[PDB]
Copies of this chain bind each other. A is one copy, B any other.
């Protein structure tokens, strides 16, 4: 039982790490958009 439950916890943590990486990419994009579209005017096509 101990072996099985440890495996369950490990799977949960690995999937959490992957999802966190995705969310971090999204947050970086959002910060860039805040800096370049709200605090300035952007000439990049279809960025804002």
A10-28 contacts to B (CB < 8 Å) = 10-11, 14-15, 17-18, 21-22, 24-25
Q: Which residues of A pack against B, CB within 8 Å?
A: 10-11, 14-15, 17-18, 21-22, 24-25, 35-36, 39-40, 42-47
Chain A contact residues, majority secondary structure: helix
Whether A40 contacts B36 by the Cβ 8 Å rule is: no
Shortest Cβ gap from A19 to chain B (Å): 9
Which residue of B is nearest A36, CB measured?
Answer: B45
CB-based closest 3 A-B pairs: A40-B45, A35-B46, A36-B45
13 more CB-based (< 8 A) A-B contacts, given A15-B17, A35-B46, A36-B44: A10-B11, A14-B14, A17-B18, A21-B21, A22-B24, A25-B25, A35-B45, A36-B45, A36-B46, A36-B47, A39-B45, A42-B45, A43-B43
